[PDB]
Design a protein around this ligand. Sequence first.
Ligand code: SRM
Ligand code: SF4
Ligand SMILES: [K+]
Length: 464
Amino acid sequence: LLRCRLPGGVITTKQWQAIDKFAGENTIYGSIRLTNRQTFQFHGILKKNVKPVHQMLHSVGLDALATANDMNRNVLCTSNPYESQLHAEAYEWAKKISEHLLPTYLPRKFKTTVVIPPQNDIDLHANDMNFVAIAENGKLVGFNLLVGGGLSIEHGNKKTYARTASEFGYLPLEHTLAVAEAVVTTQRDWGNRTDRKNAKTKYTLERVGVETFKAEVERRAGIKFEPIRPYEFTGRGDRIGWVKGIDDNWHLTLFIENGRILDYPARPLKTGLLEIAKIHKGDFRITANQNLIIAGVPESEKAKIEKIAKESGLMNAVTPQRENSMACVSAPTCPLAMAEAERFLPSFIDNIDNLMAKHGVSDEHIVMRVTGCPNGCGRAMLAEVGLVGKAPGRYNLHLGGNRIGTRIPRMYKENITEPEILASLDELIGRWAKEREAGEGFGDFTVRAGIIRPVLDPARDLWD
Ligand code: SRM
Ligand code: SF4
Ligand SMILES: [K+]
């Protein structure tokens, strides 16, 4: 298992050229796959090239996690904050936390984020430990801590569940690393290590109580949490296209379907990004939506970058729906896949696009995700509409998450095929288009209209 460490998704152009060369010359599939934890993956590395890949990473200052005994995963950071000035400091903290957590064997893998409101692109409620940035005058002052998210479930096993993360309170910036260590060590000591399916922090928190866990974190960190400082999210999508950054700089976010970077007929996505890497003055940022930001472009350089991106297919226009849809890798490389996800999503969203147009809502979107099995890598258990693989061509259909990702969708129909899913969604999108209140999301609508009951307390009410 290769898990390349890349805190906050920030990768230099020199690093990009090295991984582009390795992908093209030394793997079966020839691709760079952007992951939804803001890093990248190679597929099909032969025996001959396992030592070459660690040497390649080392040659450009990169390393991979030693997953055999390191339970941490890549630390996420909001990639393109609306207050652009905040990114540098939030990224420095994501790096500091990532380095602090490098090898305490944990009972189960442990996932961390740094989040900049109002964007929940990094999907904080899928993660064990979340630092929500609070700023004054463009400078970080501290974080709200949320603990205990995680999405993996087992079909037919009501002792497993997806759980969102719980607020603990606010900490000043100076206590960040002491708090991070206290959460990690409390989970290390209190986790149910014997039953692997019950070892995640989400289960520990439910077993001992949020207040009990919080009190122990306070004791170990040597602090008292302050009350939560106000924060609100407005969405989880990327900002596709150009946005103004700091100074005279601009950020170009490229939609990349499934994060799969390969040269396709009339669409040389991989060569295009190499050509951009060779001229770009700044870094790239891999987003938690499996897209890529060409970050820190001077205004004078926008036209040159955009020319390559447009000619290579990297700026091919897609619907808002497609920009807000996601799938996990699944087949052909994942050994755990029950149904296709990545290879299913493009034509599935073709069909969803037709339904949206039919009902007059082609400018709207529904956060819609497909995961190939209930481990949940595609983050379907935080979607407005989630599909969870069950068997070849068959999925459980979940409804009633929200746009900002703070609610788990309940299962609506079990073990159904794509035609059955599209027939259900045709009827329901039609109802939404005609009956929604101003700005009301599809997920919230299915709850308000009584189509599905909400999940209010997942450890107790996720399962019917
Ligand atoms: C690539 C990625 C999906 C994607 O399309 O982007 C992915 C792919 C895989 N995940 Fe994951 N996971 C990916 C994000 C996630 C997330 C979402 C997230 O973290 O934001 C989850 C759900 C959140 C959570 O952990 O609760 C996730 C939960 C899992 C689990 C279930 C863990 C559990 O608690 O039970 C497994 C299975 C396991 O660990 O045994 C897993 C296992 C796998 C493996 C390695 C399958 C395996 O054990 O052999 C997958 C490799 C497929 C392949 O061929 O490449 N992956 N995986 C993501 C890589 C992120 C990264 O860079 O580290
Ligand atoms: S959700 Fe299942 S099928 Fe998809 S990548 Fe994760 S483990 Fe593989
Ligand atoms: K994408």
